[PDB]
Amino acid sequence: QFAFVFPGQGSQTVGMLADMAASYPIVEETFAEASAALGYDLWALTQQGPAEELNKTWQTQPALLTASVALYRVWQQQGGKAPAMMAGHSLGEYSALVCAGVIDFADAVRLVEMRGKFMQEAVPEGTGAMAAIIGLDDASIAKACEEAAEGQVVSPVNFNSPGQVVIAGHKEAVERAGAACKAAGAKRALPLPVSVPSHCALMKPAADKLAVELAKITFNAPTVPVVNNVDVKCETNGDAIRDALVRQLYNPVQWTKSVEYMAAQGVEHLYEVGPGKVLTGLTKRIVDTLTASALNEPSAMAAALEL
């Protein structure tokens, strides 16, 4: 049995899905739906860039959601069976919820554009930072962050695998926390092209704004289980899923535990339904007997549909 996993920010690149679109018209048709909802040509953005535009998060997010939904649509069109379960990394959670029939596609495109805007405006540029902590155990990192906070905010915001954890918060506190992580024996603490300090307390007021928008949108029952980032739970109540998306924004993404959870449910393979191979690469580091592969090139898509 397999699950579909859907990537988030960082997985975009200019030119992504070009080959798939050339093999499958439903890709650009899907992007045309999104672009009608957005009021600009999203496909052209993804194909032409420039990178700096594609990397602006209120454009990144709809771009990624659309890419993932397009790939799902190809799978389904070509006779692919539904996965046993779905999960997505931050933005990817929205993609999963669309593919699982919870949120209308166009609604979700508009939603994640607004999500990105709320996120971008959360704090002044130069206020926040993110850092990747490499080669330290989850607990040591949380403690380093606690000690380092000193009435600012800093906390683990992505648990991506054992020994790969992103922290975020106020710039100064993220500096202190990095240093402490190093001191605690971390192999690296790499500063990221952040700005937006996602998935920590700094995102509260953004989350409160998101809540207001989410409430306007119809949520349906999922047709396939979606493991959520915040609680590692498969909610089915439309209104519980909504609430989990609000809480998602200012709480850590529990990716490590979500992958463990899927494995525990009997999932044996993760297909990454989106551009890049980021979640694919995480998989074996979380559960070494799990396999993963991406479904963003025609041939790979073909090979999977043969199974």
Curated annotation (Swiss-Prot):
Keywords: Acyltransferase, Fatty acid biosynthesis, Fatty acid metabolism, Lipid biosynthesis, Lipid metabolism, Transferase. Gene3D superfamilies: Malonyl-CoA ACP transacylase, ACP-binding, Malonyl-Coenzyme A Acyl Carrier Protein, domain 2. Its EC number is 2.3.1.39. The keyword Transferase applies. It comes from the Bacteria. GO terms for molecular function: [acyl-carrier-protein] S-malonyltransferase activity. NCBIfam families: fabD (TIGR00128). This is Malonyl CoA-acyl carrier protein transacylase. The lineage of its organism: Bacteria, Pseudomonadati, Pseudomonadota, Gammaproteobacteria, Enterobacterales. The gene is fabD.
